[PDB]
């Protein structure tokens, strides 16, 4: 019936990214959307959980699998405040999601577009709320806005 | 405590995945000749697209060591790790991945392009071919 904008979901991901920031983790937030509903939320928790896979995007994808009772999450859209790493990019491929939408650019997702392990095609949208996403990462890494 | 010794344990784990009707891949994470992580493929039955054998072993390893970084560990996998699991090995900063048989479909190499990329912070060493035929026999029996 209705669809929220990209910016609406990115703003929720930005809220989640601050949860990681407050816990002294790389401040990335992610939200997985199917039929205009949240089926997954994530923020970075690798350090506190002792889990090298606990990135924001992975946590949202795992929550989606639990919501759908299906390791395949067809036609879902994953929002991430930061360009996903190679581990998370492969997880989306195996998840068979429809679209990834990320804020600021960064291995990373762009480096692995035509990698031989890409049986499925995921659509890419970038730049949504780029300024807000970059502000979190620059404040966490003490870098200028140029980076 | 040879490569073949650890691969044989991963082969035992790969049959657990077979018994669960999953793509039969097993993995064992070894640090200083001790097992710190064991995993087998469970992605379909667990509704988790990340629940591959290699990730399951690394996740248990992170909790056994109380550290998401698993320095100097060696990960044994009966099957060539996918891109997702290769990315997990990089972030875990393990020393070496040892796998049996390659993926005939997705391989160009593909794992080297991701694990041993020269412009990367960490390089994971690759050893392949350990009990490859035994690893392949499990996967072929599962496919048709
Ligand atoms: Zn990631
Ligand atoms: Zn994998």
Numbering used by the authors:
A (entry chain B): 3 to 108, 115 to 155
B (entry chain A): 6 to 113, 115 to 150
Paper text:
To confer the favorable attributes of ABEs upon a CBE, we envisioned transforming TadA into an enzyme capable of robust cytidine deamination and subsequently generated an improved class of CBEs that uses TadA instead of a naturally occurring cytidine deaminase. Here we describe the development of two families of base editors, CABE-Ts and CBE-Ts, which use variants of TadA to catalyze the deamination of cytosines with either retention (CABE-Ts) or loss (CBE-Ts) of adenine deamination. To illuminate how amino acid substitutions identified from directed evolution affect TADAC’s substrate tolerance, we determined crystal structures of TadA*8.20 from ABE8.20-m13, the template used to evolve CABE-T1, and TADAC-1 variants from CABE-T1 reported here. Through X-ray crystallography, we show how the accumulation of substitutions impacts the shape of the active site cavity and may contribute to the accommodation of cytosine as substrate and the subsequent shift in specificity toward C-to-U deamination.
